[PDB]
RNA sequence: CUCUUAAGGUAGCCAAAUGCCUCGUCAUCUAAUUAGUGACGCGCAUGAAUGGAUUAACGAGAUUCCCACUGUCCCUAUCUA
RNA sequence: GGAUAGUGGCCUACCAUGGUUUCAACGGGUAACGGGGAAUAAGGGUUCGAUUCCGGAGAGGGAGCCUGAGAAACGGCUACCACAUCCAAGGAAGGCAGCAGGCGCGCAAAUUACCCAAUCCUAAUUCAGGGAGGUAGUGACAAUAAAUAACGAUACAUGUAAUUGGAAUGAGUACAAUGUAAAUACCUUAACGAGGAACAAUUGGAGGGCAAGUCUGGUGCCAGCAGCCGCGGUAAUUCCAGCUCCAAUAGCGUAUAUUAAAGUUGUUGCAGUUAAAAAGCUCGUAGUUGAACUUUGGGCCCGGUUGCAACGGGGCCUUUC
RNA sequence: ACCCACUCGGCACCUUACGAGAAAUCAAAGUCUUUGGGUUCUGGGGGGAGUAUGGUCGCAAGGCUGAAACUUAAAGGAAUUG
RNA sequence: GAAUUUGGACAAACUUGGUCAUUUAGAGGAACUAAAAGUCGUAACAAGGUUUCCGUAGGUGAACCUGCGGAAGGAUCAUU
């Protein structure tokens, strides 16, 4: 048969399951970033540990040391371009210092609130999930899309989606088929 | 000792649902428990409750 | 297994030949040939993946079965023939001759070279053997035997081959100092000067290796292959010249087109 | 020293005496020897399927009381009669003598759950149709 | 019991159990 | 709890070559068993060198079953001196 | 010597008396095909691996053999055994552990669908064939992304109310067009298709462990719950319900197995006076383990890598290659 | 023979514990999460059970070896106040 | 050159016997466990009313009793 399709989990469960600060702290979370569940916060943690581990087998290696310098520079590099570890923080070491939180603030759902395109995050998410925003060239749907910090600059509304161009909707449309007969004709 | 095996649960008046408007599923209902717990709403007692009495 | 396998799944093929993996269940099976099943490249692996010419199997066939494509000044008609190291692929329609060499990845390189150098082609001296009739003859890496050669051509020397009449123009001797192409291991596709010889009676023969830069690598005498000597190679090199940077001045190459 | 060898050839020993006190062990012992084949009316295996042969009532152990209502269910496996405890307020009623019943563990891996004596399984299906789903009015049994 | 007239009783079962074991064959 | 003896049959063993009832009861053996065997035992009337219980080997001893084998029989016939 | 393609006790003839073994032979078990690998995992490990690749073996159980380069072949044959089809009773034909599909077994697993277009394979061969394979059907195995609403106005004290307004969209549906071998679906879209947006989210819980109720009704050591501790006996925060609340969420619970937790298998890394555990004592073979000592120490060079220094070499002398 | 001082080896003892331990206590039961001097034996919750079975030794009594099914949320140690 | 046919080696399979393994019936016997506030006594925990316990041996309805040697885990760290 076919080479196997190769398959990965994204996230993983907390391993107590009812921790009140732990679970504050996730509720806190997914109200300020407009999170659907908990799998969101763990997805971004385990995004986060993998990230760690890779950075704490490179620290334990010796500096200059051909591998910790070639795939350190790439993590920070690809960090950085997300947007997660800043442009001052190029060290290896801050990338075991980051967070949950900047990651969360590079979501699309987080950049079109900050942008001023959403009244909030929730806005923000349904204006994702119903193709209201285009990142370039592109409508992207996915309130998670980790925007590259070139793209910033590009986070603007479709030529459809009728907020940033051509048509005027669909409801509108309903509405004005109905406002011609309550005008009276 | 059979022929009791009923002796609570069919003597129980079947009281009925309560019909309410529905809950907002989902994001909406993580945003509701939100406001709900960390606007600081008059839910305290002292430190903390999530149930009245 | 009761005979001669017939079928080669897909993960089982060569890995050099940058096979999809999810397009289908089997790879091309290099039919019996001059090279090697491993060490080989299929023509139609070479024409629908290596030059995007076909794009299907069906249209590699098509492209072979009008005499196109042409191993080492023969037609080859067979989907999966199994052309190698040092083999000339010239097809007259779209009119270029292509040399089969390994990149420094290890792979077998898109290598164009005009007519004029794609007339001959280089061969590994696998024997030297007395046949019938007490004619010397020399067994090349390709399978090829030549009669009458050269008395003075031993084993792991090359032969420059004509491949139109088939016979020894010149040779190249195995000592030290000549440049020599490696054909196998971890230094697939790496090239280099011979510094020295490790003999091992018994065991296998090893040979170090020093490329253009002064890196020097050891690596087993069956799978270098001598090409001339320094700065003068009896062939056309690929692109990069067998010097196998690192991966990070590798990244820097690449970080240099801004 | 600690009461083991400590020198560097001394694996053999090393290895031998941790397989000699592994057969301390109740897992490794049990799974070794294979209990759950031979022994363990389920042939290692998470359900088994039954016919129901008796209603019945054993008082629960102190200090407790309220008899449980079990049924004895003979396997079509292998053969054996378990006594099955059937988990609901009620949930007698919809399980009949002579009767297919699915049953699984009692989540104690032998060793009966709770102050019901002896019994070691729960009823998990009757007739084809789930226990929990004739408690509630989801689904109802087919006629028998 | 005491575990010296545990074992006592033990064994006086055991050479009951020999005995039984003998007379049949 | 009684009456009572010198002591009240202990360890064992048993319808046993010792049990009346009795062809005892249960099991096994068989189609069928007053037979045999294994158990049970308030045992008419078992039992400790009047030796108890058991025992490999041995036995022209008593007994039951099985295989083989056969005129013992079904059912007789024939031949020789 | 025979036999084999060939080595070889592979077989035979004669001869020798050897070969393995506590460093575990031989025998027994495996609900054992081996490996690549998988789960879990601070490190060390524990467990699993029928199964996408490699190797092996088998085609109901054995055995034998024809052809052929290659089979001890089974969608080849021959025989026996067990099954089992047909029959005009004379006879004849079998082998799904290929693809579908049926029965049986079970806790436990899909369509008697389309196609050679791709991947490749086979032949005399560019054409034919391929249940190999691909495509679709079933499918909450597992995995990925993530709809169930968003924003205003009014009253009340940022939030409360079946007080109300304008937008947005796909879930669906559907001209076409793309996709496809022909489709389906996805992507893209004409028109339709939101107001208790009924286009209504569930699965388990609220004594502790463990997030969440001395709320109300019911039951009264009953019914039942409860992994464990326990709760139920007319005052139930634990059962049956209503309301409310908590957890995870298109998933959640239950059972079994296994992993971590387990430093409760301990090499890292357990414990043995009294909790389980030092043999009654000594000898002793295998095993494990076993005191110290032989060129050190000066000096001169060349040359590396990092920042004159540090660190690393290689070469000479010094009784020394 | 005794006295004094020293010394090696031995049965012990007293005080203190740096230290150890759950504690009782311990100059070893210390030099152990700062975990490795060598080495043998044994244990892995409580019962069932040192039982059944097989082997072996024994005249026998018994010794050595030695399960499982099943069952159970404690059993147990040291110490404190009653 | 077919039928047939001699002798070989390879040998399925069947019959009988042997042996091993795994299930399984069984009169009766003898245990264990659970439940049961049944009967009989009160063996242990206080010097538990005979200190307890270990090994061994014998006896007795039952716990247990008794002899011999041992232990303190004793009810004694103690008579220069
Ligand atoms: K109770
Ligand atoms: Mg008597
Ligand atoms: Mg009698
Ligand atoms: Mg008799
Ligand atoms: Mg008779
Ligand atoms: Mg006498
Ligand atoms: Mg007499
Ligand atoms: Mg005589
Ligand atoms: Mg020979
Ligand atoms: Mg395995
Ligand atoms: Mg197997
Ligand atoms: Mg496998
Ligand atoms: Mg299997
Ligand atoms: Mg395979
Ligand atoms: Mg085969
Ligand atoms: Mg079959
Ligand atoms: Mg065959
Ligand atoms: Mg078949
Ligand atoms: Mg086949
Ligand atoms: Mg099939
Ligand atoms: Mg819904
Ligand atoms: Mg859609
Ligand atoms: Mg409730
Ligand atoms: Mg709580
Ligand atoms: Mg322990
Ligand atoms: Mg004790
Ligand atoms: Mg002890
Ligand atoms: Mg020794
Ligand atoms: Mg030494
Ligand atoms: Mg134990
Ligand atoms: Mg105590
Ligand atoms: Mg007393
Ligand atoms: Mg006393
Ligand atoms: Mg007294």
Redesign the pocket.
């Given at each position: 048969?076919?080479?196997?399709?190769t398959?990965?989990?994204?996230?993983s469960?907390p391993?107590?399951?009812?921790?009140?600060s732990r679970?504050?702290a996730?509720?806190k979370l997914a109200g300020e970033f407009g999170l659907?569940?908990?799998?969101?916060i763990?997805?971004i943690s385990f995004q986060l540990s993998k990230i760690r581990r890779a950075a704490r087998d490179l620290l334990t290696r010796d500096e200059?040391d051909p591998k910790r310098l070639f795939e350190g520079n790439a993590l920070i590099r690809r960090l950085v371009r997300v947007g997660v570890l800043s442009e001052d923080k190029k060290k290896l070491d801050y990338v075991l210092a980051l967070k949950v939180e900047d990651f969360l603030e590079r979501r699309l759902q987080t950049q079109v609130y900050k942008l001023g395109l959403?009244?909030?995050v929730?806005?923000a998410?349904?204006?994702?999930?119903?193709?209201?925003i285009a990142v370039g060239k592109q409508?992207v749907?996915?309130?998670?899309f980790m925007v590259r910090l070139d793209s910033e600059k590009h986070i603007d509304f479709a030529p459809?989606?009728?907020?940033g161009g051509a048509?005027?909707?669909?409801?509108?449309?309903?509405?004005?088929?109905r406002?011609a007969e309550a005008s009276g004709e | 000792?059979?022929a009791?095996?009923?002796?609570?649960?069919?003597?129980?008046?079947?009281?009925?649902?309560?019909?309410?408007?529905?809950?907002?599923?989902?994001?909406?209902?993580?945003?509701?428990?939100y406001?709900?717990?960390f606007?600081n709403?008059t839910l305290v007692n002292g430190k903390?409750?999530?149930?009245?009495? | 297994?009761?005979?001669?396998?017939?079928?080669?799944?897909?993960?089982?093929a060569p890995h050099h030949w940058l096979?999809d993996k999810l397009?289908?269940?089997?790879?091309?099976?290099?039919?019996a040939g001059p090279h090697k099943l491993r060490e080989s490249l299929?023509l139609?692996?070479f024409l629908?993946?290596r030059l995007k010419y076909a794009?299907?199997?069906?249209?590699?066939?098509?492209i072979?079965?009008?005499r196109h494509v042409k191993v080492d000044g023969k037609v080859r008609?067979d989907?999966?023939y199994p052309a190698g190291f040092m083999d000339v692929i010239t097809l007259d329609a779209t009119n270029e001759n292509f040399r089969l060499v390994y990149d420094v990845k290890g792979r077998f390189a898109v290598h164009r070279i005009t007519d004029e150098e794609a007339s001959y082609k280089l061969g590994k001296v696998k024997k030297v053997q007395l046949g019938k009739k007490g004619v010397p003859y020399v067994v090349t890496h390709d399978g090829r035997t030549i009669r009458y050669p050269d008395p003075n051509i031993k084993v792991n020397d090359t032969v420059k081959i004509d491949l139109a009449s088939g016979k020894i123009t010149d040779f190249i001797k195995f000592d030290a100092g000549k440049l020599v192409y490696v054909t196998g291991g971890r230094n697939l596709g790496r090239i280099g000067t011979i510094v020295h010889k490790e003999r091992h009676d018994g065991g296998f023969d090893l040979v170090h290796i020093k490329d253009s830069l002064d890196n020097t690598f050891v690596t087993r005498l069956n799978n270098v292959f001598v090409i001339g000597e320094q700065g003068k190679p009896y062939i056309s090199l690929p692109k990069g010249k067998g010097i196998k940077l690192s991966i990070a001045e590798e990244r820097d190459r690449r970080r240099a087109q801004q | 020293?600690?009461?083991?060898?400590?020198?560097?050839?001394?694996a053999?020993?090393?290895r031998?005496?941790?397989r000699?006190?592994?057969?301390?062990?109740?897992?490794?012992?049990?799974?070794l020897?294979?209990?759950?084949?031979?022994?363990?009316?389920?042939?290692?295996?998470?359900?088994?399927?039954?016919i129901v042969l008796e209603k019945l009532?054993i008082?629960?152990?102190?200090?407790?009381?309220?008899?449980?209502?079990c049924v004895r269910v003979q396997?079509?496996?292998?053969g054996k009669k378990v006594t099955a405890?059937?988990?609901?307020?009620?949930?007698?009623n919809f399980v009949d003598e002579n009767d297919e019943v699915?049953l699984?563990?009692?989540?104690?891996?032998?060793?009966?759950?709770?102050?019901?004596?002896?019994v070691?399984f729960?009823v998990?299906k009757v007739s084809g149709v789930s226990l929990?789903a004739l408690?509630?009015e989801k689904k109802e049994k087919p006629r028998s | 019991?005491?575990?010296?007239?545990?074992?006592?009783?033990?064994?006086?079962?055991?050479?009951?159990?020999?005995?039984?074991?003998?007379?049949?064959?």
């Open positions: 048969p076919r080479a196997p399709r398959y990965s989990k994204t996230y469960t391993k107590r399951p009812y921790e009140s679970l504050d996730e509720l659907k569940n908990k799998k969101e763990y997805r200059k959403a009244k909030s929730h806005h998410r349904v204006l994702i999930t119903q193709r209201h409508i749907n996915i309130p998670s459809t989606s009728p907020f048509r005027p909707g669909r409801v509108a449309r309903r509405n004005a088929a406002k | 000792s059979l009791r095996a009923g002796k609570v649960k069919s003597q129980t008046p079947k009281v009925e649902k309560t019909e309410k408007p529905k809950k907002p599923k989902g994001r909406a209902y993580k945003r509701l428990l406001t709900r717990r606007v709403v903390r409750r999530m149930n009245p009495g | 297994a009761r005979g001669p396998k017939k079928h080669l799944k897909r993960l089982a096979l397009s289908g269940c089997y790879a091309p099976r290099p039919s299929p139609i692996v629908r993946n794009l299907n199997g069906r249209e590699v066939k098509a072979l079965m009008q008609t989907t999966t | 020293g600690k009461g083991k060898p400590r020198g560097l050839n001394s053999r020993k090393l031998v005496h941790r000699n006190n592994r057969w301390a062990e109740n897992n490794y012992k049990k799974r020897l294979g209990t759950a084949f031979k022994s363990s009316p389920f042939g290692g295996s998470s359900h088994a399927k039954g009532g008082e629960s152990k102190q200090p407790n009381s309220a008899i449980r209502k396997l079509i496996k292998n405890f059937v988990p609901n307020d009620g949930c007698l699915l699984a563990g009692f989540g104690r891996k032998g060793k009966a759950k709770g102050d019901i004596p002896g070691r729960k998990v929990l408690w509630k | 019991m005491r575990a010296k007239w545990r074992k006592k009783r033990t064994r006086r079962l055991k050479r009951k159990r020999r005995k039984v074991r003998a007379r049949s064959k």
